[PDB]
Ligand binder design. Structure first.
Ligand SMILES: O=C(COP(=O)(O)O)[C@@H](O)[C@H](O)COP(=O)(O)O
Ligand SMILES: O=C(COP(=O)(O)O)[C@@H](O)[C@H](O)COP(=O)(O)O
Ligand SMILES: O=C(COP(=O)(O)O)[C@@H](O)[C@H](O)COP(=O)(O)O
Lengths: 109, 467, 467, 109, 157
């Protein structure tokens, strides 16, 4: 009873899961806060795997002990750039690597 | 001063056993587990090891007195008997920094493990650990890239990476090889890979494989929107032939290649690691033949030494075992050498098999690769054991899916992401792993088919390599 | 034809155990000694070994059916239990010629011994022998020169050649090194040599050693009227650095260089052996680290496999052990692999550890080198065991002479020539050896001093590597 | 109170200032005349930073002591090429470098 | 200039590192022009000819910010590179706003200059005017209003 796998563009981590509810998004941002990672919102007109850089929304949220504060920035960013992909990333400054990364908004249509 | 040549055989323990010695921070320290032959005392056995692995031979030579032997000789500075083992001891031996060629793992091995293992006066010998002093660590390049730079290069964050070894090991043509590669990668795996004994053979010559695989990477990447890679095996008969292969991989813009560091050797591997650094190609290190050396706990070299030697010689990935899979891996000591291959500072901890505190002076970590006899049911354990900074590899666990490669790849990628989400949310992968998997199988039919297929398959045997 | 994909785990013995198989002359045959885990049947253990070392993995993959698996799979075609050992077996496995890259020892090892040694279902595993088919042997260069050509190049006929390792192992400056070399060579030794862990170090950088040693060779040769040589160690961190060193040896007109084939690796060694053939430099192969692998008879690889692998990769000399010296060497199996490294055709003979008849298709032999803890009293035994086509090496047995190096060298050269004359005349070296030595000591005071010094020194321990 | 900077294509000198009034354009042309630079009008269908050459409108205004004369040529050029970018450049023939350069017209829409 | 370089750091005069204005104008001429007459008031001891060897762009870098812009333009003119390290990355809103602030400040000063305004007298006014329509410029002017580097110069002529 085998299906042939559909071709579908993906967006790295969590993009094979059914889309994150806002509660699931907040659970991931809570994890960041607890892990001590700094949230950063980035947006891009495209999702090309080759490109290294998306555009930074404001600055990283360095002083953040509040998932809603992150969620507010995502809402605000999505308002200004609903035509764009928006992605939440966590940054570990001790190992200096981005530890978390998932798309929270794909562009309209 | 050096005064008085007296010809003839003395006891090694006269010159080389120095229980009052306190190791300098520039000393290379080795821990040996040994059993002396009957009537050979432990301290004379330890001193024989220190002697023949540094400066000494079997009689007195006058040439010693031309130099300053106190500053060059190895010093068996401590012996302790193994708790509960009869006639088994640890010798701890210090070696001066001066004894070693800078940046040469080949030379370090030739000294420490060159001859002493075949001493008639010794029944069995096993090197457990080496404390590489920071002054020596800094003469090596290390990983071409290492964990952080690799994730940045590939845009891969927030999870273990997923690979797949193409099967059968041997037999497929270059075209069918790339076929299997395209279907795996399009399904959601980050990497595919040559099996370690795919080099260049009558049924499939290497340049043909590189060419068809490059095409499969471009296609599957264009389709999925994620960076894809395939560890092309450049392991070869000669340096020249190895470079040739590495060069064509670069020409094709392949992000990652593969090398068998033990069967090819540390001299060739160090050449390749340097090349990779200069050419921005990632280096996956396969550990073929390691178990010939590291399996039995009475004789050989423990893998955690080989892992430290490779971090020095250079590799971006290294196979670390699965613990839970078809090949042997003790969990305690595996957590030990994964720390040794990843972290910058690892405290001594004998419960993890870590005999010496190791510092890496900011030398990049090596991604551990869990590969061998693992499938979807193992996923929560693999994530719990290794964490994000790992590559989990499913050969039969992808190509043996009922519906083929792409469904097989989706099953694993879904299983993985589910486990990572559950973990981030605070679920216990240990307790809730099968439930997290069954939940995900509710909405992923290809995952469900894999869970069904491999429900009964466990590998549970007595581990020979007990701490 | 290949019909029907059925996903899931089967028994290895279903596909890979083939007790009806008769090996083709082009098959590579391996003999493994193994102990299965409790509840793992011998034939399933043998088939697991054949599977994971050829084409198979742990579940069924559909990709098998794209190819012709019958013609690629390893075939465990015979199992026998070890006589008198409980739960120990020999598996004999045939591998198709197609599985191997031409002229690559690296690839052969990666396949045969890559992963199977760490199988959880297997307690211990040891590779005893490999029958290299002639069709494969012919894809290798082999020794750069080999026994006949070497003797012709050096004008050395009618006796074992005599060498000496300079001591201390480490610590001497380049000038004192050459000093010790000149005094040894002027005394009647054919060769001196770097110790295996002399590469390039703070106290003595390699180019300095090469330069001062070259001078010592010219002087001692001009004095004695015999060709002299010194195995300069070109073992290095990288291929590039190894070639650089080999190149300066050629520039100086040095007839012979030295390489550690296991700690440097087979890929670097094969590079060097090719170079040596093209540049007419003789290649002495040191076997450092071999005992980490080959000592214990339950797990590892027997040296006679490593010796065959090196004859293929390329070397003109190879250390073979002494039997009688400070390091372990079983006489029966030593005579076995000395034949394997010297002769063109060696019949199977299990009393010598020779599991398979080996043909070498006119590939040159490798001079065995007896080195380690031997002195003048050992000379009749060394000559009887090894015969003319050997190199006998006395490190401490030269530099530990009461009067120094040149008297030490004369003592050994006189002891040797006396034994060879006595042998040619029909004296029994076994019965009359000490008498032949005492007779020669009557007219050779430096020989007498050596006989005096080492009269009491024997190495007599239980050999771990029992057949 | 930080804003995220908008992405907006620019056109080199003066293009970060609010668009030049015709009085401001003339003030710049006066500067040229005074400095002794020769005005040149160039137009191009595109504004690619990589390309070296735009198309010359007639010839450089070598004998020019009159800002309006330049402004007349710009008007005339904009009539013929309103679909194009039009740029005023000054040329120092002593140092042989273009000393002034600003866009005076972007294409329609 | 002889060995070869297209840019060379020349100092700021006004910034965190020492630079005497008189002698700085001297060696900027020496690194830019084809013929420089001897002038001991500028520290130029000998007339130097360069036989048509190309000039080197002077680079003003070190402890400068938007408030320095009119002075930097007046001192160095067009043929210069003005560099703001902390004066870009230390902007309240980050790098891109920091870059816009400097680029707007610069272009404003250049326009004012071309129109005949005195950068010396009117510099702060030109900057305040531009800050009226450039919020990121306004934020930078606010931030660095008080920051001057005014010490006794050791390298007196
Ligand atoms: O055949 C293999 C895996 O295949 P599969 O995924 O089909 O089991 C080998 O590459 C093992 O991973 C090697 O051992 P280590 O990783 O223990 O070195
Ligand atoms: O130190 C050595 C000999 O010194 P000496 O002559 O002073 O004993 C080594 O080179 C051994 O020969 C190596 O072992 P194998 O030859 O058994 O590989
Ligand atoms: O750190 C610097 C500038 O940083 P910032 O822009 O943050 O002040 C240096 O490059 C100085 O410019 C060098 O001196 P000179 O230019 O005087 O040689």
């Amino acid at each position: 009873s085998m299906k042939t796998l559909p071709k579908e563009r993906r967006f790295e981590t969590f993009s094979y899961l059914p889309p994150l509810s806002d509660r699931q998004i907040a659970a991931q941002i809570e994890y960041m806060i607890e892990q001590g990672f700094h949230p950063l919102i980035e947006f891009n007109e495209h999702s090309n795997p080759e490109e290294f850089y998306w555009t930074m929304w404001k600055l990283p949220l360095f002083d953040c002990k509040s998932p809603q504060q992150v969620l507010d920035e995502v809402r605000e960013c999505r308002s200004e750039y609903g035509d764009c992909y928006i992605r939440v990333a966590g940054f570990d400054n001790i190992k200096e690597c981005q530890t978390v990364s998932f798309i929270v908004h794909r562009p309209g249509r | 001063s050096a005064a008085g040549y007296k010809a003839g055989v003395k006891d090694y323990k006269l010159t080389y056993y120095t229980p009052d010695y306190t190791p300098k921070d520039t000393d290379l320290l080795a821990a040996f587990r040994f059993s002396p032959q009957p009537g050979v005392p432990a301290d004379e056995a330890g001193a024989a090891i220190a002697a023949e692995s540094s400066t000494g031979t079997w009689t007195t030579v006058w040439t010693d007195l031309l130099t300053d032997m106190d500053r060059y000789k190895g010093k068996c500075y401590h012996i302790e008997p193994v708790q509960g083992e009869e006639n088994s001891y640890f010798a701890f031996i210090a070696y001066p920094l001066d004894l070693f060629e800078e940046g040469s793992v080949t030379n370090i091995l030739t000294s420490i493990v060159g001859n002493v293992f075949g001493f008639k006066a010794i029944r069995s010998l096993r090197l457990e650990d080496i404390r590489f002093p920071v002054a020596l660590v800094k003469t090596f390049q290390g990983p071409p890239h290492g964990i952080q730079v690799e994730r940045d290069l590939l845009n891969k964050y927030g999870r273990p990476m997923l690979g797949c070894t193409i099967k059968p090991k041997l037999g497929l043509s270059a075209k069918n090889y790339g076929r299997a590669v395209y279907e795996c990668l399009r399904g959601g795996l980050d990497f595919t890979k040559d099996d370690e004994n795919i080099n260049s053979q009558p049924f499939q010559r290497w340049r043909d494989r590189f060419l068809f695989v490059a095409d499969a990477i471009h296609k599957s990447q264009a389709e999925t929107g994620e960076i894809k890679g395939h560890y092309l095996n450049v392991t070869a008969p000669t340096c020249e032939e190895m470079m040739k292969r590495a060069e064509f991989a670069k020409e094709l813009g392949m992000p990652i290649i593969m090398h068998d560091f033990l069967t090819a050797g540390f001299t060739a591997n160090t050449t390749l690691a340097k090349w990779c650094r200069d050419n921005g190609v990632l280096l996956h290190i396969h550990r073929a033949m390691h178990a010939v050396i590291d399996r039995q706990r009475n004789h050989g070299i423990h893998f955690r030494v080989l892992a430290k030697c490779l971090r020095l010689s250079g590799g971006d990935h290294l196979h670390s075992g699965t613990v839970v899979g078809k090949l042997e891996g003790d969990k305690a000591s595996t957590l030990g050498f994964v720390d040794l291959m990843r972290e910058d500072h690892i405290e001594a901890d004998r419960s993890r098999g870590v005999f010496f505190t190791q510092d890496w002076a900011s030398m990049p970590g090596v991604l551990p690769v869990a590969s061998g006899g693992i499938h979807v049911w193992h996923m929560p354990a693999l994530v719990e054991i290794f964490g994000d900074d790992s590559v989990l590899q499913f050969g039969g666990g992808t190509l043996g899916h009922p519906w083929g490669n792409a469904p097989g790849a989706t099953a694993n990628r879904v299983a993985l992401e589910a486990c990572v989400q559950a973990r981030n949310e605070g679920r216990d992968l240990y307790r809730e792993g099968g439930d997290i998997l069954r939940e995900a199988g509710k909405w992923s039919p290809e995952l469900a088919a894999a869970l069904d297929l491999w429900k009964e398959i466990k590998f549970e045997f007595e581990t020979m390599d007990k701490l």
